[PDB]
Amino acid sequence: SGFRKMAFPSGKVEGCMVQVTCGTTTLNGLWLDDVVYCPRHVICTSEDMLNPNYEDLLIRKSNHNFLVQAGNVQLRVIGHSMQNCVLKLKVDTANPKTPKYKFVRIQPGQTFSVLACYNGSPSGVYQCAMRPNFTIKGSFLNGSCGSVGFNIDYDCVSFCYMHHMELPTGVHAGTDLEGNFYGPFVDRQTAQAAGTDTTITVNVLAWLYAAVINGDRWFLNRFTTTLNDFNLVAMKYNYEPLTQDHVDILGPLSAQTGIAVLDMCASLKELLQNGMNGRTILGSALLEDEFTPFDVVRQCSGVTF
Amino acid sequence: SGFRKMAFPSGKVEGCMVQVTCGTTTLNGLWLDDVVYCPRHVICTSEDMLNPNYEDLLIRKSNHNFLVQAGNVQLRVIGHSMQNCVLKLKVDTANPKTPKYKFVRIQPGQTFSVLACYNGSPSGVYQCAMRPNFTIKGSFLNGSCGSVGFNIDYDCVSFCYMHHMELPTGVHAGTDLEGNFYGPFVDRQTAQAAGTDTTITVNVLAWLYAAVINGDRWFLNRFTTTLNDFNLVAMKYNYEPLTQDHVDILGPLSAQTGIAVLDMCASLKELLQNGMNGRTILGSALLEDEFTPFDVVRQCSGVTFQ
Numbered sequence: 001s002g003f004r005k006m007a008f009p010s011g012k013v014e015g016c017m018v019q020v021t022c023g024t025t026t027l028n029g030l031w032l033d034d035v036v037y038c039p040r041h042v043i044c045t046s047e048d049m050l051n052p053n054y055e056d057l058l059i060r061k062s063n064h065n066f067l068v069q070a071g072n073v074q075l076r077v078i079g080h081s082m083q084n085c086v087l088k089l090k091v092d093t094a095n096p097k098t099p100k101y102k103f104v105r106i107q108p109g110q111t112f113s114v115l116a117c118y119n120g121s122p123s124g125v126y127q128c129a130m131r132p133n134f135t136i137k138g139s140f141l142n143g144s145c146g147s148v149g150f151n152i153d154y155d156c157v158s159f160c161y162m163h164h165m166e167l168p169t170g171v172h173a174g175t176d177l178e179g180n181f182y183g184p185f186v187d188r189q190t191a192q193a194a195g196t197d198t199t200i201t202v203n204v205l206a207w208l209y210a211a212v213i214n215g216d217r218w219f220l221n222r223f224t225t226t227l228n229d230f231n232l233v234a235m236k237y238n239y240e241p242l243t244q245d246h247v248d249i250l251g252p253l254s255a256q257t258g259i260a261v262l263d264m265c266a267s268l269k270e271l272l273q274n275g276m277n278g279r280t281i282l283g284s285a286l287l288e289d290e291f292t293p294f295d296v297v298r299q300c301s302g303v304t305f
Numbered sequence: 306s307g308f309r310k311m312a313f314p315s316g317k318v319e320g321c322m323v324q325v326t327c328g329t330t331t332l333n334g335l336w337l338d339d340v341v342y343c344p345r346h347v348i349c350t351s352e353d354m355l356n357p358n359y360e361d362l363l364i365r366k367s368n369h370n371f372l373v374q375a376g377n378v379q380l381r382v383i384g385h386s387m388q389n390c391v392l393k394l395k396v397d398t399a400n401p402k403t404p405k406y407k408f409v410r411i412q413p414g415q416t417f418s419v420l421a422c423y424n425g426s427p428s429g430v431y432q433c434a435m436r437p438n439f440t441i442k443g444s445f446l447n448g449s450c451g452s453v454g455f456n457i458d459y460d461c462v463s464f465c466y467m468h469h470m471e472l473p474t475g476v477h478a479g480t481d482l483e484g485n486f487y488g489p490f491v492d493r494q495t496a497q498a499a500g501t502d503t504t505i506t507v508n509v510l511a512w513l514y515a516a517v518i519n520g521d522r523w524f525l526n527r528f529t530t531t532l533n534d535f536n537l538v539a540m541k542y543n544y545e546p547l548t549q550d551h552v553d554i555l556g557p558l559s560a561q562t563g564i565a566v567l568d569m570c571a572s573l574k575e576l577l578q579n580g581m582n583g584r585t586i587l588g589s590a591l592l593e594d595e596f597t598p599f600d601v602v603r604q605c606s607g608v609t610f611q
């Protein structure tokens with residue numbers, strides 16, 4: 001028993017982190033087979049970053065403009081190209097620690113583990129979710145660009161996030177590993193801002209199920225509701241609409257606990273309307289929305305990799 | 306910016322996890338050099354749960370009564386010995402993935418990363434603290450015994466916890482890697498229960514300093530406090546006493562932010578009195594106590610957002 005914010009074991013990813021230097025800029029890269037992936041803004045000076053022409057800045061660059069360091073070994077760069085906002089550096093050595101992997105683009109509301117790195121060296125691991133406004137509430141300092149986010153299925157690492165920038169509210173934006181940004185953001189020093197965010201309803205319901213499984217039942221009541229009525233409450237409180245697909249996904253937890261989703265929705269409706277009355281749920285005074293239904297089942301069942 | 310429960314990268318520990326089987330019982334072991342460490346209760350049967358004599362149970366075992374599996378490889382046990390509540394199995398192969406490591410016994414309030422494992426396979430990593438009542442509030446299912454807690458400051462793995470059992474309230478008890486339990490717990494099915502827990506005051510203060518470093522000051526006030534008056538108030542909310550050692554430990558964070566330690570104590574007294582009036586601190590609506598002063602310095606910028 002117990003319930004904790006839990007990350008995937010990070011070993012398979014640690015063995016892929018390297019340091020990439022171009023001029024005076026050092027950041028992190030991801031070394032898979034004979035290619036290193038990193039943010040393309042590594043090629044920019046501060047001057048360039050105000051209005052970069054990435055097409056022109058890269059053609060100016062050649063293989064010898066890049067230094068790649070794997071622990072204490074220099075990797076020789078033998079080719080370079082760009083895919084969207086990701087720079088790809090071909091190196092002369094395949095990473096012998098390359099795991100089975102895929103590049104996957106995730107949806108808002110989905111969670112992943114982040115391996116925060118500095119100068120190519122892993123520093124910490126934490127769990128976070130892609131927010132509805134396509135930012136992540138990370139923990140990142142200068143030099144963290146190129147840190148990655150991932151999930152694991154058995155032996156296969158699914159890379160879903162590469163870190164590029166911090167927004168003025170202190171939240172973070174990045175790309176998938178094909179270099180496509182999450183959210184309406186660009187890799188240039190210009191006025192940018194997180195949009196207003198919403199709460200991930202299906203995840204809050206999943207966490208309420210986790211609380212019931214762990215013995216926290218005070219918020220349960222005799223009432224049920226409908227999707228239409230509940231979604232009018234959700235809109236009022238800036239919660240994401242609940243769809244029939246969300247209800248289906250929660251089906252397992254509904255069967256295990258005896259609380260139909262619309263039964264639990266009736267609890268959540270009451271918690272939104274009335275508050276928590278000084279009580280906590282799984283040790284939180286807020287309604288937690290960065291556990292997916294899968295995360296709850298995994299943690300309540302002990303799935304291993 | 307940001308502030309997260311942040312674990313250490315777990316790879317160096319993943320390479321040490323193995324499965325140990327004795328009879329019908331399977332749990333996790335830690336393979337370092339040519340020794341596998343695991344809870345000695347792996348040798349207990351169903352009728353041994355209440356009053357096992359581990360000396361008598363162990364003398365009946367041969368080396369080949371222990372099955373150790375490292376991924377797909379069976380390791381051969383060539384000796385065994387018991388140290389306090391840990392079993393040490395000598396195997397015929399040194400672990401080629403053994404990191405630089407040490408064993409350390411921690412004090413209440415200290416934090417560490419936990420690599421939760423089942424059948425020798427890692428499942429997840431999270432951060433924990435040793436509570437003042439010598440329990441940890443973990444996430445552990447059946448078969449998690451032998452999972453370990455650790456820190457990795459400066460490329461050396463300091464192992465500080467091995468998981469042994471769950472108490473009635475759902476919190477967890479275990480040993481250091483010399484097999485000495487944290488707290489008064491014993492490896493017996495006994496009516497044993499965690500004591501009343503308390504809040505780790507020095508950690509709450511560290512986390513308030515983290516909030517100031519990351520740019521928030523709304524909870525400060527114009528007052529100060531003596532150390533004794535602070536403790537007299539805080540203990541009425543079931544907070545641990547703050548010692549001069551704790552005041553000294555907070556010096557560097559006090560220096561980085563310009564907020565005297567006893568002035569931050571005055572802020573905490575007022576937060577206990579008032580609540581947060583609908584606000585949050587670093588994303589939380591409660592006062593967080595599982596970040597140490599060292600943890601805050603590890604994770605936060607060395608430059609305050611003034």
Ligand SMILES: CC(C)(C)c1ccc(N(C(=O)c2c[nH]cn2)[C@@H](C(=O)NC2CCCCC2)c2cccnc2)cc1
Pocket residue numbers: 001330331332346349354445446447448449450469470471472492493494495
């Ligand atoms: C023999 C002894 C010392 C009484 C014992 C027995 C079982 C286990 N537990 C194993 O899961 C387990 C043991 N061997 C393989 N798995 C579990 C456990 O503590 N239940 C307790 C139930 C109440 C009475 C005391 C034991 C466990 C569950 C979840 C997380 N952590 C551990 C621990 C200790």
Ligand SMILES: [Cl-]
Pocket residue numbers: 410411412415
């Ligand atoms: Cl300590």
Ligand code: NA
Pocket residue numbers: 032033034
């Ligand atoms: Na590849």
Ligand code: NA
Pocket residue numbers: 220221222223224262263264266267
């Ligand atoms: Na209900």
